[PDB]
Amino acid sequence: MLLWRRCRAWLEIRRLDKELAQSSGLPLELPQIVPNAWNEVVWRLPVPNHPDAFMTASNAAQSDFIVYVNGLAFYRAWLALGVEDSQACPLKQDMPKDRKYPSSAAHFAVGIDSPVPLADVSPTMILGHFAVCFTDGMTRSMWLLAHEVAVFPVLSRDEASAVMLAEHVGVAAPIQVSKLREQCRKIL
């Protein structure tokens, strides 16, 4: 029921608040941009006690922006959507119960040969507070979070939205997809 879910979500957010407080200003494991047998931005993501995951900005528009997000912070902002929204975030413990989760785990298993495209997310406002919502990529985000990936990239529609995401959940300034692609080519 509803009070049940609200109280659960409240307690998880409080947990996240503490964790973020403890780990404030400590170094996190970053995605690693890798050289690739294609013409795309690809990252190696370390996954604790698990084989590496690989993701790609292949399905991004040149106009999109990349934001590298603190997983815990991203998770907390997702919970801010509340519990009734169709995009409501399951508690981490229940994420593997999600219907598409096995299909996502399957995709993440392939590796560098078929990297998983990024999620497309947006900053929004819910009952007067900041939250994150999705255009796509909720399940793969759950996989990442349930597997405790510390930092991962996400896609945002435009500069201001990406700056807003980075402000609340980012570990770095946003960078435009077109400009990152260019730099990857000039360096990697």
Q: Which residues bind ligand AUC (CB under 6 A)?
A: 30-31, 33, 43, 68, 104, 107, 116-117, 139-140, 175, 180, 183
Q: Is the Cβ of residue 33 or residue 91 nearer to ligand AUC in the bound state?
A: 33
| Residue 112 CA: distances (Å) to CA of 24, 38, 78 | 32, 11, 28
Q: Is the Cβ of residue 9 or residue 95 nearer to ligand AUC in the bound state?
A: 95
Q: Provide the minimum distance between the beta carbon of 89 and ligand AUC in the complex, in angstroms, as a whole number.
A: 16
Q: What is the spatial distance between Cα 144 and Cα 118, in angstroms, rounded to a whole number?
A: 11
Q: Is the Cβ of residue 104 or residue 122 nearer to ligand AUC in the bound state?
A: 104
Q: Provide the minimum distance between the beta carbon of 7 and ligand AUC in the complex, in angstroms, as a whole number.
A: 30
Q: Provide the minimum distance between the beta carbon of 43 and ligand AUC in the complex, in angstroms, as a whole number.
A: 6
Q: Which two tokens stand for residue 3?
A: 């009070």
Burial of residue 75, with CB atoms counted within 10 A of its CB: 0-12 exposed, 13-18 middle, 19 or more buried: buried
Q: What is the spatial distance between Cα 154 and Cα 28, in angstroms, rounded to a whole number?
A: 17
Q: Provide the minimum distance between the beta carbon of 183 and ligand AUC in the complex, in angstroms, as a whole number.
A: 4
Q: Which two tokens stand for residue 184?
A: 């990857």
